[PDB]
Amino acid sequence: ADAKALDELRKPKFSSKYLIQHVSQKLIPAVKEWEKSYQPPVIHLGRVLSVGDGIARVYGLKSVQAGELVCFDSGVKGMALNLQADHVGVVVFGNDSVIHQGDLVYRTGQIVNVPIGPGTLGRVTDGLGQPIDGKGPLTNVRSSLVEVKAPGIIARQSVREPLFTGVKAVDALVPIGRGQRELIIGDRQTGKTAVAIDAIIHQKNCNEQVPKAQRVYCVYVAVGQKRSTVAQLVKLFTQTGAMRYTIMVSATASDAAPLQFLAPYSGCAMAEYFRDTGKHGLIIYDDLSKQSVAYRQMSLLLRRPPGREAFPGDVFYLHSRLLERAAKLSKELGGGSLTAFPVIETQAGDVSAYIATNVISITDGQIFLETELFYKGIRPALNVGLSVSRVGSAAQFPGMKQVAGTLKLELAQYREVAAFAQFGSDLDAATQYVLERGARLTEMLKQKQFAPIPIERQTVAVYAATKGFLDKVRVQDIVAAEEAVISQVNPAVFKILKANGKITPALDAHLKAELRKVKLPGA
Amino acid sequence: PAIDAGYVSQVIGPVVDVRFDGELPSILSSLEVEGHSVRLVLEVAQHMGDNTVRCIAMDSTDGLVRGQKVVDTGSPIKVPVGRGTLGRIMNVIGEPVDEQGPIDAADIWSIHREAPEFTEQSTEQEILVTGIKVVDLLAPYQRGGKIGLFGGAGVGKTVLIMELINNVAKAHGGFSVFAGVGERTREGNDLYREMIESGVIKLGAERGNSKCTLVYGQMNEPPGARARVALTGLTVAEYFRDIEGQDVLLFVDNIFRFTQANSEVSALLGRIPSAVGYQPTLATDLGGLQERITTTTKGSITSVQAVYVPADDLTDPAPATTFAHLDATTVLSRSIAELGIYPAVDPLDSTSRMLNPNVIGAEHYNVARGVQKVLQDYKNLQDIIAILGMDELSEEDKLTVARARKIQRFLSQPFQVAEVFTGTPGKYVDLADTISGFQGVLTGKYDDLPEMAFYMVGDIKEVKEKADKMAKDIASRKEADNKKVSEELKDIPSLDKLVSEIKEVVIEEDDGLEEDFKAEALSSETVVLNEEGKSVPLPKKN
Ligand SMILES: Nc1ncnc2c1ncn2[C@@H]1O[C@H](COP(=O)(O)OP(=O)(O)OP(=O)(O)O)[C@@H](O)[C@H]1O
Ligand SMILES: Nc1ncnc2c1ncn2[C@@H]1O[C@H](COP(=O)(O)OP(=O)(O)O)[C@@H](O)[C@H]1O
Ligand SMILES: [Mg+2]
Ligand SMILES: [Mg+2]
């Protein structure tokens, strides 16, 4: 049946109309007697053809945009993924057990958007911006799209400001620039979340000492986590006071995979408010490896062809178009920044996984957290030979940069002589020196949870370790030795080190002097 | 005016169907969507069969309604080519994305063309010196060759491609094209700003003295943009090769992203997937792009492509397909990188067509093959050494393990582009020095030196310098006891005299959050559109 031959059937060629007029006088009375069984016809609204697996097929919706929030009449939102010739495939931001065939779908006229602004600051929302903390609606807020394109080449500048984390291992070894993206990659239960939580608590501690434009407003995106974990984290952020500056977006493990796929984009749209108006944002996507699993669920339920491990093939684009919005803008665009901490859980240390090597080739560095260092109690279990941050380097604290090159070199030689002698019987007594210095330093860098340190109290603490001043202390009492050093050093030198930026030679003189009248517990 | 202006039939992600009621556009033709928020170009991919063409969007399709007017331009995507493109940044469709004004077009060429013919080919093998020890020794580059850097997300192929830019693209007096395909936007800004600093790119009225032109399709772009931006950079390089008639340097960061973008697109085009997940047309799409990147009889293109390997998997179909298109394949390994050896070049996996004694001379070739023989012999010994230790080896085996550790460390090199984060200044090692030094370490002239004297040095003069210095520092570890410049009266104030000079800051107490924020009035009911397009509350019925 050729379309050349179906085009000639538009022209009338009946040559007799003895039942055109017969039914055209009878069609309307026969249609009228079945009006109880007619659903009202649908053109600009939609009617659900078929719902299942969290994807509805919607008849009608003649004027929906691709990628648009639609609203089912039961109040559940959706997103028009693929407009087809006969239907619209929408993706249900919620459970599809409340959508029926024959339900009405309403176009809302706007591509998928979340409330951004100053009024979402402090709140706990779901993956689409509705609050779940129970304290009412989002007020002092405005709507903005979740799938904004990242800024281009000319809209950026290089990262210069040093974004202190409060972790001695991070701020000394793997330092973070302020528009940077740093992957926190590790196994299960290796302190991945703890580094990001410490960064958020430290931004609370630093926001009350900086003048209104060097403040960092954190966003925690919890994708695929438990809801009790998120409740405990909101309790911690509230009691430390860090919820004054934090937005908390959560699409937990019970939630639909569209909400878990969309929640990092919602949190990124909320933090891009602070990037776009000249302020600085911190965003933590906790388990981006669970957003990838939710997107794989959505793709295999859409019957898209699986690729490597089962992943859709655009699971690189999923995270790249996410993390590229973490930028440092130029001075013509306000100079705001957005620092990202994607978190990727790794299975048994396999860094050569698909999603892991995807996010490694997106982010500017990595923070590797090992199970063999975490089981030994070296916490944070930062793999110093593998962790790296090249964009934040030569953009860190200048006193910490003066001190920490010796620390990186001494931990490098400690790794060398532990790579040579994993059993202790052959002691050079200069290899014993680098072993004792490395064991002193790796006791120095390990710290406790939920208490981040200011950068001058880390600079002085690693100054007292990369030099002498701690070789009296043996290997155990270093955790009390550095606390005695922070306690017994006259606290003016912390003000001079914070204000000047680096250790001046007068301050180096007073610092060598002040580290001699310190009562070390190893005596 | 209605005919040859068709309408959007169905929108599936990066893939748009447009129905034309008469005289369909050709495959590869460019189509413009009217009324989009941005400029949306659609490249025709297939004719679906019912007056419908199947298109690839060069930008986002968020906002496409299923009746939207789509205008055929009658020609493929044409980008500005010429000397006026030098110093500018272009995107996939040839627009300036550097805010310097419109691009001075000597011509506008379509980005789709055939490869040069078999008669047009060039068979000339002269070496390209890169100043890198492992590259010049074991897999030397050809001056009109396709060069591939194979790597696995974090092994150093952007740092290698930047060091090759710094070493090669200044002595090489032609024009450069940097086609950034699917990489970080931060890295494009880094390269752009460092080229403005070193004067390779000149702004304003000095723009004609620029030497490099940048084409960028970075990893925030949609899959249709990253699938065609390599063809845009190729078109800019092919103008300089075919019309200006001169040598071009084309650097393509991650030509894998071209294949990955076509693999994202190919799912929605209704194709049965090939191996691991890829399009059935991997070899032919990749070969049609790669066979345009050649030197012909009228000009030269020295090509350096970074190639990503997907899960450190060199048997994945995209790296395994692109291996056969290159003259020199430098394979970077993660196990080499984890030993601190940088550049992390696997010396027993990096090959060239130039490692041939009739091309490089028998001295170079014999040194390179002897180095590879020692390294392969150590690789065969490593399974014994890991279990039984080096105490079970022969004395011949201990000699080859010691020599192979020395030539493993000697292949590493500091880069000038790595010195901003390593701190060690980089060394350009000449090829004659590379051959002589590696021959000396082969014959046993430098068995007196330790292993770490060879690590991260330029040439064999610096091994002996570092070996004197490491030995020299084996004694000198003290006498920083007194006689300081840091006692209390040297030039020192008191601590409270230091406190008063601190510029006290005023902490503003109000966060500056509602400076000019226009809060819209969010409705506590979902506002939707009814059948007449009017905004109404959501009706209270299920
Ligand atoms: N720096 C630290 N010092 C002491 N204990 C720590 C430290 N970091 C984490 N821990 C402890 O280790 C446990 C794991 O921490 P955390 O939840 O941060 O790891 P995780 O990587 O998030 O694991 P998962 O992703 O499975 O939740 C926690 O119970 C915490 O109390
Ligand atoms: N020659 C080198 N010297 C020192 N470090 C290097 C070198 N090459 C690579 N690296 C390290 O490897 C990391 C990843 O390299 P990069 O080229 O950015 O990765 P990719 O190969 O994914 O592009 C860099 O951040 C750098 O720290
Ligand atoms: Mg966790
Ligand atoms: Mg790269």
CA pair distance A233, B77, nearest whole angstrom: 51
Contacts of A121 (CB under 8 A, 6+ apart): A217, A244, A245, A246, A247, B513
Quote the tokens at residue B326: 């290159």
CA pair distance B489, A111, nearest whole angstrom: 69
CA pair distance B127, B133, nearest whole angstrom: 14
Of B353, B383, B401, the position where a domain reaches its end is B353
CA pair distance A345, A187, nearest whole angstrom: 5
Return the H-helix or E-strand segment holding A142. strand A142-145
CA pair distance A66, A86, nearest whole angstrom: 15
- Tell me if residue A177 falls in helix, strand or coil: coil
Return the H-helix or E-strand segment holding A389. strand A388-389
Count Cα atoms within 13 angstroms, Cβ side, for B195: 28
**List of E strands, B247-389:** 247-253, 300-308, 328-331, 351-352
Q: Are A407 and A463 in contact (CB under 8 A)?
A: no
- Quickly count: other Cβ atoms within 10 Å of residue A521's Cβ: 14
To the nearest whole angstrom, how far is the Cα of A360 from the nearest Cα of chain B?
A: 6
Q: Are A87 and A81 in contact (CB under 8 A)?
A: no
The residue annotated as part of the active site, out of B69, B83, B184, B202, is B184
CATH number where B4 lies: 2.40.10.170
Mutation target for B interface from A42, A73, A83, A396: give the one with most B CBs within 10 A.
Answer: A83
Contacts of B534 (CB under 8 A, 6+ apart): none
Q: Find, among B366, B129, B133, B103, the residue nearest to B236 by Cα.
A: B103
- Looking at the structure, tell me whether residues B238 and B250 fall in a common domain: yes
Measuring from atom 24 of ligand 2, which residue has the nearest CA? B156
Residue carrying the six token digits 């790796």: A442
Q: Which atom of ligand 1 is nearest to the CA of A195?
A: 18
Q: Are A344 and A355 in contact (CB under 8 A)?
A: yes
Can the peptide bond before residue A380 be classed as cis, meaning omega within 30 degrees of 0?
yes
CA pair distance B367, B369, nearest whole angstrom: 6
- Looking at the structure, tell me whether residues B102 and B218 fall in a common domain: yes
β-bridge mates for residue A77, sequence order: A71, A93
- Looking at the structure, tell me whether residues B362 and B257 fall in a common domain: no
List the Cα angle B317/B323/B324 in 5-degree steps.
Answer: 110
CA distances from A195 to A181, A209, B221 (A): 14, 22, 31
Of B310, B336, B353, the position where a domain reaches its end is B353
β-bridge mates for residue A89, sequence order: A57, A82
CA pair distance A56, A49, nearest whole angstrom: 7
CA pair distance A425, A482, nearest whole angstrom: 30
- Looking at the structure, tell me whether residues B172 and B283 fall in a common domain: yes
- Looking at the structure, tell me whether residues B330 and B389 fall in a common domain: no
Buried-state track B314-333, b at ≥16 Cβ within 10 A, e below 16 = bebbbbebbeebbbbbbbbb
Q: Are B527 and B536 in contact (CB under 8 A)?
A: yes
HEC string of A12-56 equals: CCCCCCCCHHHHHCCHHHHHHCCCCCCCCCCCCCEEEEEEECCEE
* Residue list, ligand 1 pocket, CB within 6 Å: A 186, 188-194, 345, 379-380, 447-449
Is B19 marked as a binding-site residue? no
CA pair distance B274, B286, nearest whole angstrom: 14
* Residue list, ligand 2 pocket, CB within 6 Å: A 361, 388, 390; B 151, 153-159, 342-343, 415, 418, 422
Cα-to-chain-centroid distance, residue B86: 19
Q: Find, among B314, B311, B338, the residue nearest to A346 by Cα.
A: B311
CA pair distance B127, B116, nearest whole angstrom: 23
Q: B158 C-alpha vs ligand 2 centroid, how far in Å? A: 7
Which residue among A67, A154, A157 sits closest to B97, beta carbon to beta carbon? A154
CA pair distance A400, A460, nearest whole angstrom: 9
Q: A203 C-alpha vs ligand 1 centroid, how far in Å? A: 20
CA distances from B221 to A150, A151, A295, B92, B225 (A): 9, 11, 19, 10, 6
CA pair distance A500, A397, nearest whole angstrom: 11
Alpha helix (H) residue ranges in B415-504: 419-422, 431-443, 460-472, 495-499
Q: A246 C-alpha vs ligand 3 centroid, how far in Å? A: 18
Query: Any long-range contacts for B276-280 (C-beta under 8 Å, 24+ apart)?
Result: B276/A307, B276/A308, B276/B316, B276/B317, B277/A305, B277/A306, B277/A307, B277/A308, B277/A311, B277/A313, B278/A307, B278/B317, B278/B318
Which residue among B50, B189, B541 sits closest to A73, beta carbon to beta carbon? B541
> Is B184 known to be catalytic?
yes
Buried-state track A47-61, b at ≥16 Cβ within 10 A, e below 16 = bbbebeebbbbbbbb
CA pair distance B238, B231, nearest whole angstrom: 10
Quote the tokens at residue A362: 């997106």
Side chain identity, residue A474: R
Which residue ranges of A are tagged as binding site?
Answer: 189-194, 286-287, 379, 389-390, 447-449
- Residue ranges per domain, chain A? 24-110, 111-396, 397-523
β-bridge mates for residue B179, sequence order: B215, B252
Q: Are B84 and B103 in contact (CB under 8 A)?
A: yes
Quote the tokens at residue A137: 């609606």
CATH T-level assignment (fold) for domain A24-110 = Elongation Factor Tu (Ef-tu); domain 3 (2.40.30)
Is B187 marked as a binding-site residue? yes
CA pair distance A243, A201, nearest whole angstrom: 9
Mutation target for A interface from B7, B8, B9, B11: give the one with most A CBs within 10 A.
Answer: B11
Q: What is the DSSP letter of B70?
A: E
β-bridge mates for residue B89, sequence order: B214
Quote the tokens at residue A151: 């800024």
Quote the tokens at residue A405: 């090159």
- Tell me if residue B80 falls in helix, strand or coil: strand
Q: Are A131 and A137 in contact (CB under 8 A)?
A: yes
- Looking at the structure, tell me whether residues B367 and B340 fall in a common domain: no
Nearest ligand to the CA atom of A189: 1
Q: Are A104 and A53 in contact (CB under 8 A)?
A: no
- What does residue A61 show for φ and ψ, rounded to 5 degrees? 50, 65
List the Cα angle A350/A177/B511 in 5-degree steps.
Answer: 125
Q: Find, among B50, B4, B6, B8, the residue nearest to A64 by Cα.
A: B8
To the nearest whole angstrom, how far is the Cα of A320 from the nearest Cα of chain B?
A: 6
Q: Are B457 and B428 in contact (CB under 8 A)?
A: no
Cα-to-chain-centroid distance, residue A475: 37
Buried-state track A155-190, b at ≥16 Cβ within 10 A, e below 16 = bbbbbebbbbbbbbbbbbbbbbbbbbbbbbbbbeeb
CA pair distance B330, B147, nearest whole angstrom: 8
Q: Find, among A176, A190, A155, A226, the residue nearest to A340 by Cα.
A: A176
Quote the tokens at residue B478: 């003290």
Can the peptide bond before residue B280 be classed as cis, meaning omega within 30 degrees of 0?
no
| Burial grade of B69 (CB within 10 A; 0-12, 13-18, 19 or more) | middle
> Between chains, do B508 and A211 touch, taking CB under 8 Å as contact?
yes
- Looking at the structure, tell me whether residues B248 and B198 fall in a common domain: yes
CATH number where B117 lies: 3.40.50.300
Pocket test for ligand 1, best of A190, A382, A448 (most atoms within 8 A of CB): A190
Longest distance between any two alpha carbons in chain A, whole Å:
117
CA distances from B501 to A206, A399, A507, B375 (A): 22, 18, 13, 61
CA distances from B400 to B53, B447, B467 (A): 64, 11, 20
Q: Find, among A407, A384, A381, the residue nearest to A463 by Cα.
A: A407
The experimental method behind these coordinates is cryo-EM
Strand-by-strand arrangement of the A182-186 sheet: A124-125, A247-251, A216-223, A280-286, A337-345, A182-186, A365-369, A388-389
Resolution (Å units):
3.1
Quote the tokens at residue A172: 């000394």
Longest distance between any two alpha carbons in chain B, whole Å:
93
Q: Are B185 and A153 in contact (CB under 8 A)?
A: yes
CA pair distance A47, B453, nearest whole angstrom: 75
Which residue among B488, B496, B519 sits closest to A492, beta carbon to beta carbon? B496
Q: Are B73 and B32 in contact (CB under 8 A)?
A: yes
To the nearest whole angstrom, how far is the Cα of B91 from the nearest Cα of chain A?
A: 10
Residue carrying the six token digits 């929640």: A263
Side chain identity, residue B30: S
CATH T-level assignment (fold) for domain A111-396 = Rossmann fold (3.40.50)
CA pair distance A74, A64, nearest whole angstrom: 19
CA pair distance A434, A411, nearest whole angstrom: 9
CA pair distance A234, A238, nearest whole angstrom: 6
Total domains present in chain B: 3
Residue carrying the six token digits 């007020």: A139
- Looking at the structure, tell me whether residues B287 and B395 fall in a common domain: no
List the Cα angle A324/A327/A329 in 5-degree steps.
Answer: 140
The listed CATH number (1.10.510.10, 1.20.150.20, 1.10.3720.10, 2.60.40.10) that belongs to domain A397-523: 1.20.150.20
CATH number where B432 lies: 1.10.1140.10
Q: Are B304 and B251 in contact (CB under 8 A)?
A: yes
The residue annotated as part of the active site, out of A142, A188, A304, A390, is A390
Length of chain B in terms of residues written: 542
List the Cα angle B214/B217/B223 in 5-degree steps.
Answer: 165
CA pair distance B156, B172, nearest whole angstrom: 23
Residue carrying the six token digits 């890829």: B278
> Between chains, do A108 and B277 touch, taking CB under 8 Å as contact?
no
CA distances from A498 to A205, A280, A455 (A): 14, 20, 8
Q: Are A13 and A6 in contact (CB under 8 A)?
A: no
- Tell me if residue A85 falls in helix, strand or coil: coil
- Tell me if residue B50 falls in helix, strand or coil: coil
| Burial grade of B350 (CB within 10 A; 0-12, 13-18, 19 or more) | buried
β-bridge mates for residue A92, sequence order: A78
Q: Find, among B53, B307, B278, the residue nearest to B158 by Cα.
A: B307
Q: Measure CA of the first residue to CA of the last residue in chain A; give whole Å.
A: 99
| Burial grade of A35 (CB within 10 A; 0-12, 13-18, 19 or more) | exposed
- Tell me if residue A337 falls in helix, strand or coil: strand
Of B57, B76, B95, the position where a domain reaches its end is B76
- Looking at the structure, tell me whether residues B35 and B139 fall in a common domain: no
Helix, strand, coil percent content, chain A, rounded in steps of 5:
40, 20, 45
Q: Find, among A405, A409, A403, the residue nearest to A502 by Cα.
A: A403
CA pair distance A84, B222, nearest whole angstrom: 20
* B509 domain-assigned: no
To the nearest whole angstrom, how far is the Cα of B393 from the nearest Cα of chain A?
A: 17
Residue carrying the six token digits 């007068």: A506
- Tell me if residue A125 falls in helix, strand or coil: strand
> Between chains, do A211 and B507 touch, taking CB under 8 Å as contact?
yes
CA pair distance A360, A346, nearest whole angstrom: 12
- Looking at the structure, tell me whether residues B98 and B72 fall in a common domain: no
β-bridge mates for residue A369, sequence order: A186, A382
Count Cα atoms within 13 angstroms, Cβ side, for B187: 28
CA distances from B110 to B16, B28, B252 (A): 21, 10, 19
CA pair distance A272, A354, nearest whole angstrom: 28
Q: Which residue of B has its CA nearest to A306?
A: B277
Helices (H) and strands (E) in chain B, counts: 15, 20
B154 vs A contacts (CB less than 8 Å): 357, 360-361, 366, 388
Is B353 marked as a binding-site residue? yes
CA pair distance A437, B132, nearest whole angstrom: 35
DSSP code string of B168-237: HHHHS-SEEEEEEES--HHHHHHHHHHHHHTTSS--GGGGGG--EEEEEE-TTS-HHHHHHHHHHHHHHH
> Between chains, do A152 and B185 touch, taking CB under 8 Å as contact?
yes
Side chain identity, residue B319: P
The residue annotated as part of the active site, out of B163, B183, B238, B462, is B183
Q: Which residue of B has its CA nearest to A354?
A: B311
B182 vs A contacts (CB less than 8 Å): 320
Residue carrying the six token digits 């698909």: A354
Pocket test for ligand 2, best of B135, B159, B190, B254 (most atoms within 8 A of CB): B159
Q: Are B53 and B44 in contact (CB under 8 A)?
A: yes
Beta-strand pair A247-251/A124-125: parallel
Q: Are A338 and A326 in contact (CB under 8 A)?
A: yes
Q: Are B33 and B22 in contact (CB under 8 A)?
A: no
Which residue among A81, A305, A321 sits closest to B273, beta carbon to beta carbon? A305
Q: Are A178 and A328 in contact (CB under 8 A)?
A: yes
Helices B431-443 & B395-411 angle (0-180, nearest 10): 160
Which residue among A106, A117, A304 sits closest to B519, beta carbon to beta carbon? A117
> Between chains, do A313 and B267 touch, taking CB under 8 Å as contact?
yes
* B127 domain-assigned: yes
What is the torsional sign of CA A325, A327, A330, A333? positive
Measuring from atom 31 of ligand 1, which residue has the nearest CA? A449
CA pair distance A363, A288, nearest whole angstrom: 12
Q: Which residue of B has its CA nearest to A98?
A: B542
Mutation target for A interface from B212, B258, B262, B511: give the one with most A CBs within 10 A.
Answer: B511
Return the H-helix or E-strand segment holding A409. helix A398-420
CA pair distance B113, A480, nearest whole angstrom: 71
Domain that holds residue B37: 1-76
To the nearest whole angstrom, how far is the Cα of B17 from the nearest Cα of chain A?
A: 9
Q: Which atom of ligand 1 is nearest to the CA of A374?
A: 12
Nearest ligand to the CA atom of A286: 3
- Tell me if residue A407 falls in helix, strand or coil: helix
Residue carrying the six token digits 């582009």: B417
- Looking at the structure, tell me whether residues B120 and B157 fall in a common domain: yes
Q: Measure CA of the first residue to CA of the last residue in chain B; give whole Å.
A: 45
- Looking at the structure, tell me whether residues B349 and B397 fall in a common domain: no
Q: Find, among B134, B143, B150, the residue nearest to B330 by Cα.
A: B150
